[PDB]
Amino acid sequence: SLPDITIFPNSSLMISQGTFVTVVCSYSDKHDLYNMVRLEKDGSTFMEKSTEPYKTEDEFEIGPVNETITGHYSCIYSKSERSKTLELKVIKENVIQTPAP
C-alpha cells in the first residue's frame, strides 16, 4: 500500500467554484426503517429524495457550485435522525505563479 494522511479538524471544507460536490449520506444499521432522506442546509431542506432500496448510502450531487452553496450541511433520515454537520465554503481562487527573483 501507500501511506495515508488524515487531518483534524476536518469538518470544514474549501470547495472550488464551478465544481460538482457529491454528498454521501449513510445509515448502515438502520436504513431499512426510513423511507426519506434529506440534505439539510442552514436549517432548511435543500434536497430530498426517497431512500435507496438496494444499499445503505444515499448520494446527492450539487453543481456547478457557486457562493449560494456555502453553508452548513447534515443528512436527515425520516419515516427522524440527523448526522453530524459539515461546513462548506465555496471559493474562487486563481492558479498563481510566483516569479523567480
Question: The domain 1-101 is classified under which CATH number: 3.40.50.920, 3.30.365.10, 2.60.40.10, 1.10.3720.10?
Answer: 2.60.40.10
Cα(47)–Cα(73) distance, integer angstroms: 11
Region at 43 (left for phi over 0; alpha for psi -120 to 50; beta for the rest): left
DSSP string, 44-63: EEEEEEEPPSSSSEEEEEE-
* C-alpha cell recorded at residue 72: 452548513
Among 40, 58, 61, 62, which residue's Cα sits nearest to residue 49? 58
Cell reading at 35? 423511507
Q: How far apart are CA 49 and CA 75, in angstroms?
A: 11
Domain boundary assignment for the chain: 1-101
Resolution limit in angstroms? 1.9
